[PDB]
Symmetry: none
Subunit: 162 residues, 4 copies
């Protein structure tokens, strides 16, 4: 019904995300994360805070966010370029099954969904992801959620980057 | 005894298993040859589950920009890199690797243009303290075109709350 | 001589005086780049329209090449043949083709600091001008890095000046 | 014609070679000396043997050989890196004419030609060089002699180096 009431599953251990690398976003809300590959990175050896990092790669450009665990099964992201914070949740995760990995994550503007990222490495075959997206679309501002992998740029010999 | 004097004669150690690189992530490039790779962080990525060739990827990240290369093993302990943007191929080698020691990880890699060095990337996650890395740089600098090799992490852009990205 | 910009700037000798000095070695340099290095001057190619001369800095199998032309204030403007990058060089002093051979010290500045320093000779470092020049340059900002360039160089294989 | 029977003109005085500096190789046998500039250097002041040196410069790589005169109008080259010796001869020299300088030099493996180097500073217009090259190409192994200056790297503002 509203963004603040969506499911908030536990954040999997970082190792489960690393084992899923790289993932593609099948469904997103803004057009920022169209044609985008996600790679998770462990903290640098010398990092005192030991925050992990989410990489959102679109061609030759990249958006980076450190993240740490927060209350209520949240991930708090710190944009590495702007220092902007955002509180994210997982609607569900299904990492490293015999059919690969998927998850849907979101961040809210009160009752509205501000951003939505559904990732997978199996070309969108997980039944959980289909049901998750249909739920999110009925939340306020979820009408903007759209399939993200149409009319993306041509590749030049790499599978997941371009 | 005597240092190799052309790029084609530099050492070529075995390419470590990808897992050793992933456990090193992320690394910084302390010394590079062209300015393209100044202020840069390396992240290695396993092949996509659905990739047929199962090529791993090297990410070279400089602020909001990235350079990506798929790679596979080749002859003579080479890694054959495929630039994901252009399709250009390059044969790389490791001068040495020293991954996942009790003092962290370093390596130096290179690619040649015949007897000259064309690019050089020395990475570490220990702020440059591995003695292997110091000696390797001294060696590489002395091959044709190696005088361009330089310390790459001076005067880099300020951060906004992340340790290894900006 | 307190700062790089105020170092002496003697006239660039005619090219033939440099050619008669060939080859030279660098006794003292600032960066690591020109350790264990031999310098050879070359006239312009017959067909070169600009008739720039060329400085060759040779270290084993590696060569660094710079065309050069005269500039203002007794400068030599070097054009790196691989990149097209320009650098303004001066001579702190020259003493070419004496009865005890040839020496000079040359430098390039980054404002008040010295960016690179090259003292060349063919007499194994015995010109008294060179000792004094080095002492002066060493006190300019960044000149603390100036060091003797010919320790522990590679072994030769039958040639005197190249390896 | 076999290599051992090619002409052997007198080695010109060093100063004639210095006056021709720099030269480029128009024709060579192995690919080592493609896209290459030759510079001759007098002996170092302190060199007891007083051997001159030939510099073969291909972009950022230099090959060095000291040389001294030998029997039969030979020049004996000493590779400064490996210590390997090789007996060279001049097929002809034509240094410092009003149309510039050319020469063709060679070294043999008995009856076969092991290496060939035709230098000039006039873009290949000396008639002596044309005839010399024709002769050498008919010697055993001389079929590998080729034009050396096609598709060479682009320059960055220097005429004879790159
Ligand atoms: Cl996400
Ligand atoms: Cl690398
Ligand atoms: Cl100099
Ligand atoms: Cl020759």
């Amino acid at each position: 019904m509203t963004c603040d009431k969506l499911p908030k599953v536990p954040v999997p251990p970082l190792e489960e995300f690393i084992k899923s690398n790289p993932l593609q976003f099948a469904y997103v809300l803004t057009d920022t994360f169209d044609c985008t590959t996600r790679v998770y990175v462990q903290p640098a050896r010398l990092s005192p805070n030991q925050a992990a990092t989410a990489l959102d790669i679109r061609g030759s450009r990249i958006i980076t966010n450190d993240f740490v665990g927060g209350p209520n099964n949240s991930a708090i992201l710190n944009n590495c370029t702007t220092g902007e914070k955002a509180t994210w949740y997982f609607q569900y995760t299904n990492l490293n099954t015999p059919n690969g990995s998927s998850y849907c994550a979101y961040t809210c503007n009160g009752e509205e969904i501000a951003e939505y990222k559904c990732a997978n490495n199996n070309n969108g075959t997980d039944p959980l992801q289909k049901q998750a997206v249909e739920v999110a679309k009925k939340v306020p501002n979820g009408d903007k959620i759209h399939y993200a992998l149409d009319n993306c740029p041509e590749h030049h010999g790499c599978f997941a980057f371009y």
